[PDB]
């Protein structure tokens, strides 16, 4: 099965490491490998150097270095014991007694830093998690136009999130420039004076614009001394506190000059210097030195504001949605921020401890309490919005999850308070953020994906690569550059024709500040590397993307993530070229480190002899359960003695075929309506797919039970469960757990557990029953774990964790925990959801036998039947072209790599179809078979439709139809042909994670809520269906008064009503008349708790007791 | 203040609000009994007023009261009774109901306009009490308890249980529901047909009324119980009886994509 490659664009650079946005950021944050003396002032090192030294002010706690130890347990052990994969963190600290001048140094254990795995994820409490990068407004100085009043501008100084207040500078109508801080407006004249500024300085610097400086020449406070001006400003900012010089200077320094409380950030400082054309010494709005305040940014900001208002050519407003003004906080920056918060809390504790205690007899270990730091870190890695449960349905799912960018989270936007502007595709998203990939619904535009070639720089700004173009020749020099730098050049398109390296086309399509233009080759300065950089990894996996509407390409790219691994998964016939790279960078497959020879091949391990001679044994992840229950196993792809080169594949990962991403099956698809079973996106499949185990997946479910301590006695996990026959306990072993390999159905016992019954005398009927049968009531009851309805399979694993086991940190009162892994092999069935890369999705509605499906004249039945009517409205023509190319490849026995926007065009597909028809009809001619009578009828009908040229022989007309992608298709039920030629081809279809097996649910009676006594919700809790307001409205509109009353009372919360209804039904009677709901009683009692006398009355206004006399005081 | 299966205790925020109110009231009583100065008594009275406010309506005046160790505001009586998550809109105007199921829908072209394809297991669970009664009537089980025990385990269900279930549902109808229920024909009564599988079979002609395609839509099934409810569903809510749109009077169950194409 050879691979034919299409396309003319030569990519100069390969795709960057797809997980580098996680891995490099966390490596920079930790700096665990660089020696401490060579560590740069970034990450947790920056946090240490910022919070320390800690001075009570003669005790000084200075930080010297830190180190990270080896993790206590490996990743597999952390997953198996529900632990966190983390490394111990120690800090080397010295305590200096300024009075005595003595230093005491020791290494203090500051706690545990969670570690990132090689693939880019974390193991938190035994669960795989991904820290989604957050996009937000970059700090710095911005100049926006005032919407209420035209012609005016407002200056915003934005620090890092939760690192200082925003500073607003606005030219008021009166002419006085006003500074807004913490919702309070005050005259910027006062603070400007506090910064040691006189009238002459302002007149000299900002006086070259007009009346704007005259609005900044209020002499009522200029002659006022800086100290009293500072106190007056302190009174403005916080009125009521007694005006004191020390308190006031401390407050102002903390507000605008404290690096530990105000932080503009490296990105913020860089943006401020770039915009205002200045050089900040630090990252604060002002510096406090020599007992006085020196300005850093207020004067340049006000100068820029005045010049912008005046109308100087060189100053312009700032687009806050411009992606050069929007930056990315990756996992490293978020973890560093939370580490700094925890370190500040620890510093507070250290300050309060050194205030007390014996200053002489104090050690750094005693002062430092590491609990706040660990608490902050665990809170960040567990309960943060950006710390998300890892999506690992397939390797592409995890790869996408690691490259997602969320505008939400702590410090970001809100799902509901986000307007259209924040959700739109800005012109600067080109090459940096995928335009089409986004979750449709409430999170559209709020969550996006990093572009394939995009990378986040040191400061957090997404850069994209461009090829340098000089003198008309396109060079191999690639420059990674940001949007603000991108706006300064004319950038050609990657599809521009080139005669070698010289631009051949006289008219070049280019972009200037995001606008499309037509320029000459000499006016081009940069070129796009490839069409792939505009789209994310998921979207780059959709062949013929240029023929798909964006709304459907979104669906296709999103659904590629939801595809489940298949036991016979195979790579698509039509590929884009990223499948191998996706598999390689997902770290799901296994590759050879260097050249060598394979020594041992087994289903569990691969032992390789490398050239240097070292034996390397790679264990194979076998039947591992992902977060979503799918089975993740590695299958060896080498044999003993096989020579392997560096990077050669050793074992396929989940959803991969020979190193190519295989999210589904390549099936024979006929595009035609079929008896209404294709109606409204429904899909018809053949039984042959099930016969040869296509679309068959392996899913593992985990069931957990705990034996605990109770006041009445300990719960025992035992096989001796009271009042059960041998049939129920047949598959349980002597320890009370189900044996490995047993087949379990709903209601079967997984782990047998007995619990001591609450001391309670039985009802007299039960007592009489026991006396009649002479059976003494036992002291324990069945609380064993059973298979829930609709579940089951084969018990493949049993894990038993007992208290005191090494590394097993069970909760108090829990003697032991037992986990049962049950694996089931799911075949494709009616209700299962299939999809393709072009956004065409639908549930299987019918499974036909092989003799019922339409078949080719050679006797080959089709596998899937798709409704053509889903094509015109969705405008995703890429599936049709994929089908044509798949038909060509199916008859030619080859696969195709057609890159998006540069790949197989219609003439090439038609020449391939000509070759395919040549082989497909030459086989028939050699076998001694002419043209079918029914083929002749179809050809006559087709020439009546103008699909074939009149006057040609039947072979030539059949060739024409084949070149159009259509073949003469026969009906398996009647044997007669379909009256028109049908588009039959080979298409790649994915089986999605959404299966009717996990979604079917039913309930008669079950658990009820504690307060309202209404049924619970959710299939997991065996809950009822929510009959919300709109359903009640529908019943009211229908006039179904009694059905509505039943649903409100008899079936939801009328305790007497529901009990009587169930009893009447099981007795063969009609359900009784319902009564008042318990929810109304709860409402009345709550209203009474609000001291409101709610009384239900009758026709004669007399009170009616709805509580049955149970709340009336005698 | 309930004890969960794990032995941990779960309590509502009203207990915390009541505890704060009681603590402040008792401390004010003690301070008054001790002849505390006017400043202390005034502060304690102000705290008592603020605690009463927080109990009645938390967050209305001043900073919301939060449980120490977290920044989540405590849920007061006003929050309990107000909002989309309040008592009215969550438990009074709408409720969760018994005898209700849900499953993915597929197209049934062989169905009649008044019929739907109900999976056997969903029907068994939804019609459990009727099925137990029918099993007791026949020789399948001696009584209702034995029948329920038989139905507890999947492998203990004999083949006559399905015959009894087929006998039970005869004539009865179920309400199929697709969310959002924009109009009244978003809930329609259908005569269930027991089918092998796990997905609900929907007649094509009602899809436009339900705004349901087959790319993964799910529907809820509700079982009316009494004679009034069954009569209302069969007479008023039946799909074959609601053929015209109440909004405009034009047909709403009419030929659709493939039907129109063929005709």
């Amino acid at each position: 099965m050879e691979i034919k490659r299409f396309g003319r664009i030569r990519e100069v650079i390969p795709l960057p490491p797809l997980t580098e946005i996680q891995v490099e950021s966390y490596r920079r944050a930790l700096q665990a490998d660089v020696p401490p003396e060579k560590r740069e002032n970034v990450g947790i090192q920056a946090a240490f150097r910022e919070t320390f030294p800690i001075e009570e002010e003669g005790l000084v706690l200075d930080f010297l270095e830190y180190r990270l130890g080896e993790p206590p347990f490996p990743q597999d052990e952390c997953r198996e014991k529900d632990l966190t994969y983390q490394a111990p963190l120690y800090a080397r600290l010295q305590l200096i007694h300024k009075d005595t001048g003595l230093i005491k140094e020791d290494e203090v254990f500051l706690g545990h830093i969670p570690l990132m795995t090689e693939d880019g994820s974390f193991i938190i409490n035994g669960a795989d998690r991904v820290i989604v990068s957050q996009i937000h407004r970059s700090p710095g100085v911005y100049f926006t136009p005032d919407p209420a009043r035209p012609g005016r501008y407002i200056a915003s100084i934005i620090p890092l999130p939760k690192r200082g207040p925003w500073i607003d500078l606005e030219v008021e109508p009166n002419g006085v420039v006003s500074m807004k801080v913490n919702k309070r407006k005050f005259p910027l004249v006062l603070l400007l004076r506090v910064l040691g500024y006189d009238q002459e300085t302002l007149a000299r610097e900002l006086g070259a614009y007009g009346e704007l400086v005259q609005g900044l020449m209020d002499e009522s406070v200029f002659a006022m001394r800086p100290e009293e001006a500072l106190i007056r400003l302190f009174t403005l900012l916080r009125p009521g506190d007694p005006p004191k010089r020390d308190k006031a200077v401390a407050y102002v320094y903390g507000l605008i000059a404290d690096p530990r409380r105000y932080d503009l950030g490296e990105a913020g400082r860089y943006k401020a210097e770039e915009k205002l054309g200045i050089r900040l010494s630090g990252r604060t709005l002002a510096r406090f030195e020599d007992g006085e305040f020196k300005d850093e940014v207020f004067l340049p900001t006000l100068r820029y504001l005045f010049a912008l208002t005046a109308g100087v050519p060189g100053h312009e407003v700032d687009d806050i949605d411009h992606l050069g003004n929007r930056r990315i906080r990756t996992v490293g920056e978020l973890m560093t921020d939370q580490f700094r918060v925890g370190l500040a809390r620890l510093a507070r504790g250290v300050r309060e401890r050194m205030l007390m205690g014996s200053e002489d007899s104090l050690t750094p270990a005693k002062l430092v309490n590491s609990r706040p730091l660990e608490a902050a870190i665990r809170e960040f890695f567990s309960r943060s919005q950006l710390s998300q449960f890892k999506d690992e349905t397939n390797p592409l799912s995890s790869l996408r999850h690691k490259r997602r960018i969320s505008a939400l989270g702590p410090g970001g936007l809100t799902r509901e308070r986000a307007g259209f502007d924040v959700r739109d595709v800005h012109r600067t998203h080109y090459g940096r953020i995928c335009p089409v990939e986004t979750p449709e619904g409430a999170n559209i535009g709020l969550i996006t994906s990093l572009a394939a070639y995009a990378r986040v720089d040191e400061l957090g700004f997404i850069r994209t690569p461009y090829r340098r173009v000089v003198g008309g020749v396109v060079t191999d020099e690639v420059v990674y550059m940001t949007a603000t730098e991108e706006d300064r050049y004319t950038i050609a398109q990657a599809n521009t024709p080139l005669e070698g390296n010289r631009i051949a086309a006289e008219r070049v399509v280019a972009r200037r500040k995001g606008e499309p233009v037509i320029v000459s080759p000499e006016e081009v300065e940069f070129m796009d590397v490839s069409p792939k950089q505009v789209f994310s990894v998921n979207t780059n996996l959709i062949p013929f993307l240029e023929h798909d509407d964006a709304n459907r390409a979104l669906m296709g790219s999103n659904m590629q993530t939801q595809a489940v691994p298949l036991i016979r998964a195979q790579a698509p016939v039509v590929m884009t070229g990223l499948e191998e790279r996706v598999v390689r960078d997902s770290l799901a497959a296994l590759y050879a480190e260097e050249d060598g020879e394979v020594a041992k091949v087994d289903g569990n391990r691969i032992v390789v002899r490398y050239e240097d001679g070292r034996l390397v044994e790679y264990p194979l992840r076998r039947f591992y359960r992902s977060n979503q229950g799918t089975a993740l196993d590695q299958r060896p792809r080498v044999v003993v003695g096989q020579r392997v080169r560096k990077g050669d594949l050793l074992a396929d990962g989940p959803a991969s075929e020979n190193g190519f991403l295989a999210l589904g099956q390549n099936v024979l698809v006929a595009i035609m309506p079929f008896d209404g079973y294709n109606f409204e996106d429904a899909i018809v499949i053949s039984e042959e797919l099930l016969k040869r185990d296509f679309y068959t997946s392996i899913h593992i479910e985990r069931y957990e039970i705990e034996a605990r301590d109770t006041k009445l006695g300990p719960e025992r996990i035992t096989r001796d469960i009271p009042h059960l026959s041998e049939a129920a306990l047949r598959d349980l072993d002597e320890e009370g757990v189900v044996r490995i390999g047993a087949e379990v159905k709903p209601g079967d016992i997984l782990v047998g557990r007995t619990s001591f019954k609450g001391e309670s005398e039985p009802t007299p009927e039960e007592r009489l029953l026991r006396s009649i049968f002479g059976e003494k009531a036992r002291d324990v009851k069945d609380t064993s774990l059973r298979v829930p309805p609709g579940e089951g399979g084969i018990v493949v694993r049993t894990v038993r964790l007992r208290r005191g086991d090494p590394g097993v940190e069970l909760k108090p009162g829990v003697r032991e925990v037992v986990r049962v892994y049950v694996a089931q092999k799911r075949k494709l069935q009616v209700g299962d959801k299939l999809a393709n890369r072009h956004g065409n999705k639908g549930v299987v509605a019918k499974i036909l036998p092989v003799e019922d499906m339409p078949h080719l004249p050679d006797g080959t039945p089709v596998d899937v039947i798709l409704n053509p009517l889903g094509v015109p409205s969705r405008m995703n023509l890429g599936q049709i072209l994929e089908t044509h190319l798949g038909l060509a490849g199916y008859f030619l026995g080859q696969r195709y790599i057609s890159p998006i926007f540069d790949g197989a065009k219609e003439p090439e597909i038609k020449e391939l179809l000509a070759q395919a028809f040549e082989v497909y009809f030459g086989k028939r001619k050699g076998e001694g078979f002419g043209v079918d009578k029914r083929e002749v009828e179809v050809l006559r009908r087709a020439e009546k439709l103008g699909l074939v040229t009149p006057g040609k022989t039947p072979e030539e007309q059949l060739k024409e139809l084949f070149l159009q992608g259509k073949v003469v298709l026969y009906d398996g039920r009647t044997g007669e042909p379909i009256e028109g030629p049908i588009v039959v081809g080979q298409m790649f279809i994915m089986k999605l994670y959404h299966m009717v097996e996990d979604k079917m649910h039913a309930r008669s009676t079950g658990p009820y809520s504690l307060i309202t006594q209404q049924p619970l919700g959710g299939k997991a809790q065996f809950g009822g269906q929510r009959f919300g307001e709109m359903e009640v409205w529908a019943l009211e509109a229908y006039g179904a008064a009694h059905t509505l009353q039943e649903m409100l009372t008899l079936k939801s919360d009328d305790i007497e009503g529901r009990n009587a209804a169930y009893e009447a039904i099981i007795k063969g009677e009609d359900v009784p008349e319902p009564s008042v709901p318990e929810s109304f009683r709860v409402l009345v009692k709550e209203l009474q708790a609000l001291a409101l006398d709610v009384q239900t009355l009758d026709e004669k206004d007399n009170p009616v007791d709805i509580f049955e006399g149970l709340a009336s005081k005698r | 203040m309930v004890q969960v299966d794990g032995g941990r205790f779960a309590t509502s925020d009203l207990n915390d609000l009541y505890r704060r109110l009681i603590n402040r009231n008792n401390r004010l009583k003690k301070l008054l009994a001790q002849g505390a100065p006017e400043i202390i008594i005034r502060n304690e009275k102000r705290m008592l007023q603020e605690a009463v406010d927080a109990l009645l309506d938390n967050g209305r005046r001043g900073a919301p009261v939060t449980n120490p160790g977290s920044d989540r505001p405590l849920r007061s009586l006003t929050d309990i009774l107000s909002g989309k998550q309040g008592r009215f809109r969550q438990n009074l105007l709408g409720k969760r109901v018994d005898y209700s199921g849900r499953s993915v829908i597929v197209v049934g072209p062989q169905l009649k306009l008044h019929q739907c394809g109900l999976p056997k297991r969903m029907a068994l669970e939804l019609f459990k009490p009727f099925l137990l009664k029918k099993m007791e009537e026949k020789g399948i089980a001696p009584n209702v308890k034995a029948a329920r025990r038989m139905l507890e385990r999947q492998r203990d269900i004999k083949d006559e249980v399905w015959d009894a279930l087929e006998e039970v549902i005869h004539g009865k109808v179920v309400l199929l529901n697709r969310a959002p229920t924009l109009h009244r024909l978003g809930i329609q009564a259908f005569q269930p047909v027991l089918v092998e599988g796990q997905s609900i079979q929907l007649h094509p002609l009602v899809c436009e009324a339900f705004n349901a395609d087959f790319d993964g839509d799910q529907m809820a099934v509700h079982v009316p119980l009494s004679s009034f409810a069954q009569a209302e569903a069969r007479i008023q809510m039946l799909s074959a009886h609601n053929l015209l749109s109440p909004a405009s009077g034009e047909p709403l169950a009419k030929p659709s994509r493939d039907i129109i194409l063929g005709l």
Binding site: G240 | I39, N43, R61, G62
Partner: peptide
């Protein structure tokens, strides 16, 4: 001082 802040009001009252 601040009517809405109980702590500030108490501190102001005790500062007299």
């Amino acid at each position: 001082i601040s009517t809405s802040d109980p702590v500030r009001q108490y501190l102001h009252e005790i500062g007299q």
